[PDB]
Amino acid sequence: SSRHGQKGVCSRKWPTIDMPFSETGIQPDIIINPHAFPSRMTIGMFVESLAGKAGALHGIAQDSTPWIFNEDDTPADYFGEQLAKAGYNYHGNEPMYSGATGEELRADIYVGVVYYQRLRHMVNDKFQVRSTGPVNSLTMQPVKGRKRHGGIRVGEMERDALIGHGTSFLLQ
Amino acid sequence: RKDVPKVEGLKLEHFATGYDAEDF
Amino acid sequence: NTLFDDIFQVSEVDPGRYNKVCRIEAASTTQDQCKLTLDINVELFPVAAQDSLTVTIASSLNATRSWRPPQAGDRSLADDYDYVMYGTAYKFEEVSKDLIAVYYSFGGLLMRLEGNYRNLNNLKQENAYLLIRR
Amino acid sequence: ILRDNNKSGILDAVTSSKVNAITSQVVSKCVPDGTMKKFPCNSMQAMALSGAKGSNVNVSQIMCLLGQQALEGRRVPVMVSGKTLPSFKPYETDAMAGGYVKGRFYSGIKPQEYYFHCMAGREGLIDTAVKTSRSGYLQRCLTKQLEGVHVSYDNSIRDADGTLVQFMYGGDAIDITKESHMTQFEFCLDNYYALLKKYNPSALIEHLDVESALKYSKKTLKYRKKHSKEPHYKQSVKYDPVLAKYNPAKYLGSVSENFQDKLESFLDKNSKGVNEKKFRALMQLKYMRSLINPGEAVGIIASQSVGEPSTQMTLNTFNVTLGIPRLRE
Amino acid sequence: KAQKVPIPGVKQALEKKEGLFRKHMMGKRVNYAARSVISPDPNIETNEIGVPPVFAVKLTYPEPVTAYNIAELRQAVINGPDKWPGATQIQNE
């Protein structure tokens, strides 16, 4: 997670060779999809992303604490001046083309330094499988329990789904 | 509606590749 | 073989939110009847304002199966002309009496011509080469 | 008008009607045109103006302005004094203290109007913790009663113990999953030859009755032209529809009275070199192919057409009971 | 109908969603089933599900041997329950 509420699973550990290099040869770390944003409208991630550029060379407490700043005195236009007082790429779109290809791309790629976190409730102890397994002594049904690892429940309203497909040798 | 004290004394560092100290 | 020929005059070159293809509004010089609304890749074939193109719609190139990349020694019909496209018609509509107009789609590059005499010799075929000189 | 509830509800509904007309005068002039990057390179609109993610509210709340953050239809609540925040003069006549948020998320929102926008969060999120088992009992209340209601082999909707319910499924014995092109008569004319050999009549029309339903229908097509100007109690009750005598799975051309009148209206208005005997064959054979399957679980399937949309209708007040507490009655 | 919480009689283990008749008859737990966290992939068919090798070495299926499938069953039983196109146990006659 970033510090704006963008959760997300580490969907696939992607090899660094087929991953787009940059201006220098920088390869990124966390590819986040730009389709995630318009339902979220977390522009605070976009202005964090280019002030991580503008903090990575300068050494004052970068006032991301808000509301000393107006619309005329926008902090992306108050310290948008810092973009033009060291010659930055003022629109923030930093050079970053694809590699697997070997070309520059249509967009210039927005790239930045966003402070990520790592979440507690992790998922590496969830899956289970059962071929024939134990039973229960009352009913000769598979025994309930995550820790005995038995008995996926087909409940009341999945029986009323397999009828709905018209099939019955699945329900049998 | 005066602004906040400007950072007295910025300097420029967004520069290019393959070159060491060619800013004069 | 040659199904159509005239020498046109580009009136307006519209880039229009693109980078390569411009919508080109050409009218005839000799006749004062037909108009040409054409899309061409202006990056490959630069057309400025008030140019003089020479459209010549052909149906063959002088019996193949599919397009092979070109080779040595072959002489085509396309050597006369400095920009050649390929595509289909899809729509014939008469604007008025003696204004039967045609519509050619070159895989995404739309074209509108509008004549009165060409009704003798355009059919809404899947084969329609289109060629531009100058 | 502060000590009454219904009065100073009108004061909200007059104000926000008037001050959302400013959002007209900002959205109608900026966002297709005033943007720095035009559309086919503008990646923020290329998602929202294609159906990828988001829409033009989320375009305008980033570029134009937020707008009024009206709570539950009315407006920003008021204190006992007449202030909506301690940053305002009491009884304030303003868009801002009414909660109109002039800023946009690109340049950031002021400390007052930030606080009003958090009011639009905290009352919205509490709808989530108030609906979690509304329609949990209701869908399992239907599938226990419509538990095994199935179509039989003569299209009478019958419960599992023979006790009949309907005589054809829904009137004309069509699955909803097959009918989506059934009134696309313009489409099936276009792709006639492809849709001919999918519905291939060559090895087919010799095993089913043909010239019976084509004739008895045209009684009731002609006989209904008499009593079209009649009310329902004066109706000529001699002739029933064609499906009441003839199985649609057997008799080519037997067609319910709403699909017959819509092919004919297509074959009378839009007829240009377009024939009709080429086309009456297919679009009465497609009605034949797109019937129900005898044995289909329409007891369960109907009871999921009340269940699965019902996890969406916990929406609340901007009379008559609405949503699930209506549907429980 | 008799005198902190008393003992459930034989009706009391039968009447709720909890209890017997709605839980162990309408809602039976099954053999040969698995669950996991899911993940996206565009590079497969839309009518497919990508399965880990942990699940591919557990869930069996009875394949009766005949004159045509003996060749893909030798290479099953030659592999055994550690090499993926294999077999865990065979049933005699």
Next chain:
Amino acid sequence: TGQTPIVKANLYDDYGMDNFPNGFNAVVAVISYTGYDMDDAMIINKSADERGFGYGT
């Protein structure tokens, strides 16, 4: 591997949250490149992970 933020608050230091650094700084590319990332999914760099990246016990 605890790291302070670079985009931080002025009241980040007076509460003394450098004594308990919660997280790390990662060079993020806002990009749709692979196709294994929608619905809030993200795609890590493997050679970031194999060189230590949010490691934890």
Next chain:
Amino acid sequence: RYEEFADKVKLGRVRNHFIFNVESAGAMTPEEIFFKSVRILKNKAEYLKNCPITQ
């Protein structure tokens, strides 16, 4: 992003003129690991040729 040079200059890439930068890990000289790469690909090219097609 300027008005005066909005059209008087254009930018492009020479689509075959690469500029390799090769840094080192401290074990090997950087020109030598470029020699290793151009022969591994040749080691990868011969080895398919030295491989016969069975089924």
Next chain:
Amino acid sequence: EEPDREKIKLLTQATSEDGTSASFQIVEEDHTLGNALRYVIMKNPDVEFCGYSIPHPSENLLNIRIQTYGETTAVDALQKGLKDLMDLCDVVESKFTEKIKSM
């Protein structure tokens, strides 16, 4: 002499006995050789079709297809696709050693 027949496999569920259309399943590979090989094959003018596709990045497989006009099979076009890529990796190296020695 010990062949290593895991590395090439001609999928005969995609290959006609004309020889002009075939489908090779390489193992232990990726985009590294694939685009580099395909660029070499597409210079032989008798090759009408040549493209690679990694089926799935989890397993290390590779599929390339070659169609020809006739008068050259896919195998006689595959080998010249590999015979030149050997030489093209020597024209790089021999040009490269001759530039180090002038410093």
Next chain:
Amino acid sequence: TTCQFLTKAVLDNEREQLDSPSARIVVGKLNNVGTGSFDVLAKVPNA
């Protein structure tokens, strides 16, 4: 209310017919909605 519906069924002395699927699964008979609403019969060719 299971044994509420049992006492007025025991005193009915009722032949359950085993054709509603909530009853048909309890005896484990093949569900008659769809592929159990007909029976497949094999035709041996020779005598």
Next chain:
Amino acid sequence: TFIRGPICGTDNCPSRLWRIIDGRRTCQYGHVMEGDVEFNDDED
């Protein structure tokens, strides 16, 4: 880790016991004969 009990049947082996996942136990020569469910039961 082995815990001793009676011999096995099948006229093959006298083998001893070891456990399987959470509801039964096997031997090293695979033979398992009925009467082994640990008296599987509840809590509270």
Next chain:
Amino acid sequence: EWNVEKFKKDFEVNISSLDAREANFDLINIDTSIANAFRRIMISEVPSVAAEYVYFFNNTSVIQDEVLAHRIGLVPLKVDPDMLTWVDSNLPDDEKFTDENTIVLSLNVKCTRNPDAPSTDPKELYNNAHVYARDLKFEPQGRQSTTFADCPVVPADPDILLAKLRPGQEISLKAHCILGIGGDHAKFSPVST
């Protein structure tokens, strides 16, 4: 029309700068499909020497077992390959490390308090508080009494900070080395960028 003769007449290399770490050289008229592959192989497929199996006989300090096991593998060892050979994991433990496939390292450090007066420099205040990379000592196994005599296995930057210690604590290990592709793990990578 392309032939490999015609590639030779218009391919150029401009070696602009060539240092002992970071070389920078231009190319002319080669396609991107070949030129990415040269980038592709230099990260993954060129092999290198790295520490693989770490045997801690004693680890007592605050840096844990598995963390410091990870850092030693990251240490770039200034040893050219084509001196070792590969490992082969189709054979068991006592056969898997030879005199030819495995540089064998070891590290032994104890910290004890030095009598000093103070506000005190923590190098002067404790003996061997920093465990630098230049404390990793090569142990010659097998025939390695002259075949690594000119080049003892030195970490390429000997100032890597492997651990910090305090008096009482010790780390006593033995870490094997191996030759391997960078495509497996990101410690075999023979290039920075």
Next chain:
Amino acid sequence: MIVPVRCFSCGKVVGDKWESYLNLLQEDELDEGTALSRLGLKRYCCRRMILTHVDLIEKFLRYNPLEKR
């Protein structure tokens, strides 16, 4: 904890420069950025490992379970 050996994105060995900023302000006595410029400071894809690192191993080592006091 201690300084990471390798740059995460780029990969340069960064167990090298952690120690010159007291002497940049006691022996060289500068302000911040003048002392943040000279000694081999080059890329803000890895210049973070000066500014960003915390070095929490100093706060652990005072909790020694192996020494008197």
Next chain:
Amino acid sequence: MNRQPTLHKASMMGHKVRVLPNEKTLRLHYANTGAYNADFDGDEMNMHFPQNENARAEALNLANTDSQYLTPTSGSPVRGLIQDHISAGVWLTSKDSFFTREQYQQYIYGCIRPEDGHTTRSKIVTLPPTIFKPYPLWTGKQIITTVLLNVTPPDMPGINLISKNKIKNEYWGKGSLENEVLFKDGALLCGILDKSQYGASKYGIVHSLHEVYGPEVAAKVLSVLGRLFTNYITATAFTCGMDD
């Protein structure tokens, strides 16, 4: 497969199994999140598995994810690309997207493989390029003709379709028709492709092929475009920055 709140019958469908090495989780296509409404960030799916051959036909011919194309609640389609596979259509079927010859022989075979059961004609068939004389190029819309040429069966003629888009004509310049989707004998002649074509929207391209060819073709075309709009995305990315 079975998402646990199982309301409608499309929440428990039937799939085919593809074993993937080197992985740890179940792994599903995007386009089958329309039917479960499960988002790929912490959801559990109970994968039940049948044990007899009267059920392996009823997990193919009654309850696969190919007969589950239309929901019975309203007749609408439930299966379609999702987020970025829409936003690659506007870039692929644009009028600026030109491709060279190697690229046009690449993105076909990047998505269509004869070695799995995608082709019909046992040989990938191509098209002539829309430019001959200066430098031969293929239009981006013409690839969509090529994928609809390979997977449709050869006994059928092409498709014919007239439909709209969510994109209006004024965005693409002046006087440009880009709103009328117009297929003629299986060839795309005008119009970009959106959620209005192959999303969960009725009367699109994919919903049109579902009625003309039967549900097994309309399942393949989602599994061809669903890798055409990814082998293009891996060859050209899509972004969102601060310029917008």
